Design a protein around this ligand. Structure first.
Ligand SMILES: [Mg+2]
Ligand SMILES: [Mg+2]
Ligand SMILES: [Mg+2]
Ligand SMILES: [Mg+2]
Ligand SMILES: [Mg+2]
Ligand SMILES: [Mg+2]
Ligand SMILES: [Mg+2]
Ligand SMILES: [Mg+2]
Ligand SMILES: [Mg+2]
Ligand SMILES: [Mg+2]
Ligand SMILES: [Mg+2]
Ligand SMILES: [Mg+2]
Ligand SMILES: [Mg+2]
Ligand SMILES: [Mg+2]
Ligand SMILES: [Mg+2]
Ligand SMILES: [Mg+2]
Ligand SMILES: [Mg+2]
Ligand SMILES: [Mg+2]
Ligand SMILES: [Mg+2]
Ligand SMILES: [Mg+2]
Ligand SMILES: [Mg+2]
Ligand SMILES: [Mg+2]
Ligand SMILES: [Mg+2]
Ligand SMILES: [Mg+2]
Ligand SMILES: [Mg+2]
Ligand SMILES: [Mg+2]
Ligand SMILES: [Mg+2]
Ligand SMILES: [Mg+2]
Ligand SMILES: [Mg+2]
Ligand SMILES: [Mg+2]
Ligand SMILES: [Mg+2]
Ligand SMILES: [Mg+2]
Ligand SMILES: [Mg+2]
Ligand SMILES: [Mg+2]
Ligand SMILES: [Mg+2]
Ligand SMILES: [Mg+2]
Ligand SMILES: [Mg+2]
Ligand SMILES: [Mg+2]
Ligand SMILES: [Mg+2]
Ligand SMILES: [Mg+2]
Ligand SMILES: [Mg+2]
Ligand SMILES: [Mg+2]
Ligand SMILES: [Mg+2]
Ligand SMILES: [Mg+2]
Ligand SMILES: [Mg+2]
Ligand SMILES: [Mg+2]
Ligand SMILES: [Mg+2]
Ligand SMILES: [Mg+2]
Ligand SMILES: [Mg+2]
Ligand SMILES: [Mg+2]
Ligand SMILES: [Mg+2]
Ligand SMILES: [Mg+2]
Ligand SMILES: [Mg+2]
Ligand SMILES: [Mg+2]
Ligand SMILES: [Mg+2]
Ligand SMILES: [Mg+2]
Ligand SMILES: [Mg+2]
Ligand SMILES: [Mg+2]
Ligand SMILES: [Mg+2]
Ligand SMILES: [Mg+2]
Ligand SMILES: [Mg+2]
Ligand SMILES: [Mg+2]
Ligand SMILES: [Mg+2]
Ligand SMILES: [Mg+2]
Ligand SMILES: [Mg+2]
Lengths: 209, 124, 49, 114, 100
RNA sequence: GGUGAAAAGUACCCCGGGAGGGGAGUGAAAGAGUACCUGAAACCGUGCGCUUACAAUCCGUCAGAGCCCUCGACGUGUCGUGGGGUGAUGGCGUGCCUUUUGAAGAAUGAGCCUGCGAGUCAGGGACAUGUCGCGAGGUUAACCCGGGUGGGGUAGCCGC
RNA sequence: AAGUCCAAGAGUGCGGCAGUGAGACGGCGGGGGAUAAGCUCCGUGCGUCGAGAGGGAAACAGCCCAGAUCGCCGGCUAAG
RNA sequence: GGCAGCCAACGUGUUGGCUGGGUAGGGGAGCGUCCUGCAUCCGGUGAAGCCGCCGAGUGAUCGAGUGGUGGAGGGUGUGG
């Protein structure tokens, strides 16, 4: 039920945005969103790790020597695991690491993280990052500094607004994401989440029905 | 994620080899033979830690018996009389008395003989 | 403000895997299989009597 | 302590244990006595070790500038060096290994008082 | 003179000033404990009767609390695969005896 | 496979037939010298400390004289809540692992060190048990839109 | 009917995970053998070894005593 | 005198009582190695590795205690 003031790059405010409590006042669920972020990073894991088993390494077809009478260990090929240059036994092969959590688990984790930010006044709405027609990291940085003192911020902007995302892209602690792409991992990174009026309205309207 | 198992492997090696110093032969040089010796060493240390309390009681009894027989009394009658008299000094300090000052041992033998039956072979 | 390092699995969720054949302290030299036989190296089908 | 001079001869084509067998003759002796003993001793490993001793003496001649006759071979030893491996073919197709061994002879001499 | 104190289920020969490492006693360092006696030798005469041995106690002061030697146990039985490691350090108190 | 930041890769002198070194120089370093980062263990020496040539030793462990070193105190060499090294001597003491009713076994395997060498992974698989979400419902598969891990997708599947 | 009952860590039922299915000697009851075997085959709310350390039997898995949580330079005992 | 497992009492961390040999095997809780999300800290005024000294823990082991060597990366917390 929070009422976040919308703030303009001039240092002023225009109005306020109502945050529905079914969407920004949810009790957080540490275990649930632990599972959600762990599944997220599992999907990010490029599992491109591979070895060669006993039969994939080069050579090894021959039996190295006679099986009896030589006074030596019985050896079936030179590519056996115990050999130098031999095959790896239970070694890595490529894996897909994504796991498919239910939709409402993901949605609830989103709402819980955003509620966690809202309870502590870490959600901001702004008309836009910088006055348009041209990117400017200097002025957008100054405005964002007035807006917050913390290190990491999410900057949730609509996809069409390129001048804004360009002017905030090169700040070291700033992460830019689209409202329809919002996930629990990026909002838990951020100390503050800085919406735009359009992006806040868009996220509200995508969950208003 | 391949591990090179040598950082962890060497730790117990250094422990056992440092414990095996002074061992004659290759039981102080090679981790395997030193480990085999450490097995016996710690079992033997347990065994002898338990039996040291019996070895020392043996030694105290032997010293007490010699001192008692110098005082013209048997060991068994001496401790029977000390039990009868209520004097309740253990064999350790009774051996320190036998060695260090024999006059107190003589007096204590006197007490033990005074507190002893007029017939030790009597049917009672 | 919960951050990514404040996340923790629910108590009782994650159990440790039983790594077998890694010493005589836990399960070694047979990995819970006992001595020889058919069952010491492969299996028996469930429809075998 | 006494003033000292050093000489090292490395990768000498002599087994270490065959160098030590004549090194043990001359340890802790005057340089001239050691050189004589090596010159009349009938083992070939004397040729390297003798040279090494003489070399050390020259260092005290020319770098410490101390008296020739006070020199004593205080420390002398022979370390192992790299080994080359060869093969000698034997009966019925066997092939045995051969080691060509080497040595490092080290000498420190001191100018002790008479 | 010198007595034989009873403490910790053990008997120690003691004379004034002697320092003895006994089993753990509940007394903060600096405090004085009093201990019973199993025998007293004064010059050439000893106190062995039970009633008048109970009349005299040895007064000592606690200097510190100590850990005994580190003992390492590795139980082992051959051909069975049975090992069992553990360690033990014994807790002790150091007593400086003052009077008898 | 690995000198060094850079060859600045050791001019000149001395011993040696050379190889190799010793001075001198280069360099932050030569415990970096084109045998070159770090330089472990096995294995091989040299120096010192204690011990050992009337003695039947799974090679240790427990008790222990003598000697040697070190830390305190008083003092000026002898104790002390001491610590190390070595050990004359005394008690006890039948390697490890496999496999066996039972092996120190004269059953197997192992010369030594260092590196390596064995319950892993896939699957809406099956069963059981934790944990989480929703709950008489639960969930989507292919697929479609997202530079992402996000959002749609009711076909089916399980319960009823 | 009681006993044990801050324990036997006891029964029974359902389930998850097993290993085992080569036993040995000793006491008592027996078959086979020659009323031989350190033989072989059975019975035993019999024991110990297996899977058991410690004490005794000179040494000596299976016999007698006794079941090792650790420490102590305390005491009392068991078989002997 | 120290530890631990089961249970009980007041009560909410203590105390007490019982118990703690063990192979196949079952269960529980942990040590050390490496890679990583996030968070912090250390490091050419010298990281790692190695060699020691002096210590520590019930065990695997530890030493953000110290020296020698060394020359560029490491520690710790909480998850994967
Ligand atoms: Mg092939
Ligand atoms: Mg052979
Ligand atoms: Mg084949
Ligand atoms: Mg390969
Ligand atoms: Mg989806
Ligand atoms: Mg020794
Ligand atoms: Mg897994
Ligand atoms: Mg094994
Ligand atoms: Mg199993
Ligand atoms: Mg097997
Ligand atoms: Mg079998
Ligand atoms: Mg089986
Ligand atoms: Mg089948
Ligand atoms: Mg000659
Ligand atoms: Mg031929
Ligand atoms: Mg050969
Ligand atoms: Mg046995
Ligand atoms: Mg066995
Ligand atoms: Mg086992
Ligand atoms: Mg210079
Ligand atoms: Mg350097
Ligand atoms: Mg080399
Ligand atoms: Mg090097
Ligand atoms: Mg002699
Ligand atoms: Mg004999
Ligand atoms: Mg001995
Ligand atoms: Mg013996
Ligand atoms: Mg066989
Ligand atoms: Mg066998
Ligand atoms: Mg047999
Ligand atoms: Mg053998
Ligand atoms: Mg033999
Ligand atoms: Mg066989
Ligand atoms: Mg062999
Ligand atoms: Mg290999
Ligand atoms: Mg699977
Ligand atoms: Mg009953
Ligand atoms: Mg019980
Ligand atoms: Mg039961
Ligand atoms: Mg069968
Ligand atoms: Mg059968
Ligand atoms: Mg049977
Ligand atoms: Mg039989
Ligand atoms: Mg019979
Ligand atoms: Mg019969
Ligand atoms: Mg029979
Ligand atoms: Mg029977
Ligand atoms: Mg068996
Ligand atoms: Mg027994
Ligand atoms: Mg039994
Ligand atoms: Mg009987
Ligand atoms: Mg008695
Ligand atoms: Mg009797
Ligand atoms: Mg308790
Ligand atoms: Mg147990
Ligand atoms: Mg018990
Ligand atoms: Mg087991
Ligand atoms: Mg580490
Ligand atoms: Mg981490
Ligand atoms: Mg820094
Ligand atoms: Mg520097
Ligand atoms: Mg690393
Ligand atoms: Mg340094
Ligand atoms: Mg260092
Ligand atoms: Mg982990």
């Amino acid at each position: 039920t929070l009422k976040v003031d919308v703030k303009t790059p001039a240092g002023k405010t225009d109005g306020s945005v109502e945050l529905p409590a079914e969407l920004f006042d949810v009790e957080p669920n540490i275990a649930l969103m632990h599972q959600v972020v762990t599944a997220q990073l599992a999907a990010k894991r490029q599992g491109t790790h591979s070895t060669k088993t006993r039969g994939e390494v080069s050579g090894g077809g021959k039996k190295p020597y006679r099986q009896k009478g030589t006074g030596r260990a019985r050896q079936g090929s030179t590519r056996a695991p115990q050999f130098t240059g031999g095959g790896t036994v239970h070694g890595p092969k490529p894996r897909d690491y994504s796991q498919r959590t239910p939709k409402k688990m993901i949605a609830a984790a989103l709402r819980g993280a955003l509620s966690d930010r809202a309870r502590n006044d870490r959600i901001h709405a702004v008309t836009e990052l910088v006055e348009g027609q041209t990117p400017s990291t200097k002025s957008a940085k100054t405005f964002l500094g007035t807006l917050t003192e913390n290190k990491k911020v999410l900057v949730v902007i609509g996809r069409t607004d390129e001048v804004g995302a360009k002017s905030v892209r090169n700040l070291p602690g700033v992460h830019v994401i689209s409202p329809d792409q919002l996930n629990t991992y990026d909002v838990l990174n951020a100390d503050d989440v800085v919406f735009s009026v359009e992006a806040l309205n868009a996220y509200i309207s995508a969950n208003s029905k | 994620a391949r591990v090179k198992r040598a950082l962890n492997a060497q730790k117990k090696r250094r422990t056992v080899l440092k414990a095996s110093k002074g061992y004659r032969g290759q039981r102080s040089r090679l981790y395997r033979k030193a480990k085999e010796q450490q097995l016996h060493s710690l079992t033997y240390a347990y065994r002898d830690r338990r039996a040291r309390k019996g070895e020392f009681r043996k030694l105290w009894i032997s010293r007490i018996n010699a001192a008692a027989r110098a005082n013209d009394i048997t060991y068994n009658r001496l401790i029977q009389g000390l039990k009868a008299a209520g004097v309740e000094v253990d064999r350790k300090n009774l051996a320190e008395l036998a060695v260090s000052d024999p006059a107190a041992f003589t007096a204590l033998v006197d007490v033990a003989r005074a507190a002893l039956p007029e017939d030790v072979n009597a049917p009672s | 403000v919960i951050k990514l390092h404040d996340l923790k699995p629910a108590p009782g969720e994650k159990k440790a895997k039983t790594r077998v054949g890694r010493g005589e302290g836990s399960k070694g030299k047979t990995a819970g299989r006992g001595t020889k036989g058919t069952k010491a190296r492969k299996n028996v089908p469930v429809m075998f009597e | 302590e006494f003033p000292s001079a050093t000489a090292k001869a490395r990768y000498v084509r002599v087994s270490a244990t065959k160098a030590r067998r004549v090194i043990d003759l001359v340890r802790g002796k005057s340089v001239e006595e050691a050189l004589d003993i090596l010159r009349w001793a009938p083992q070939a490993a004397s040729e390297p070790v003798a040279k090494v001793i003489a070399s050390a003496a020259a260092n005290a001649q020319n770098n410490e500038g101390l008296d020739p006759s006070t020199l004593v071979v205080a420390t002398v030893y022979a370390d192992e060096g790299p080994t080359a491996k060869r093969i000698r073919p034997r009966a019925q197709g066997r092939a045995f290994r051969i080691r060509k061994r080497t040595s490092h002879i080290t000498v420190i001499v001191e100018s002790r008082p008479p | 003179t010198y007595a034989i104190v009873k403490t910790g289920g053990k008997q120690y020969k003691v004379a004034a000033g002697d320092v003895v490492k006994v089993e753990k006693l509940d007394s903060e360092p600096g405090a004085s404990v009093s201990l019973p006696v199993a025998l007293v030798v004064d010059g050439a005469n000893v106190t062995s009767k039970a009633d008048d041995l109970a009349k005299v106690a040895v007064t000592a002061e606690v200097l510190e609390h100590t850990k005994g030697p580190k003992i390492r146990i590795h139980k082992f039985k051959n051909k069975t695969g049975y090992h069992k490691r553990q360690g033990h350090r014994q807790q002790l108190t150091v007593l400086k005896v003052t009077g008898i």
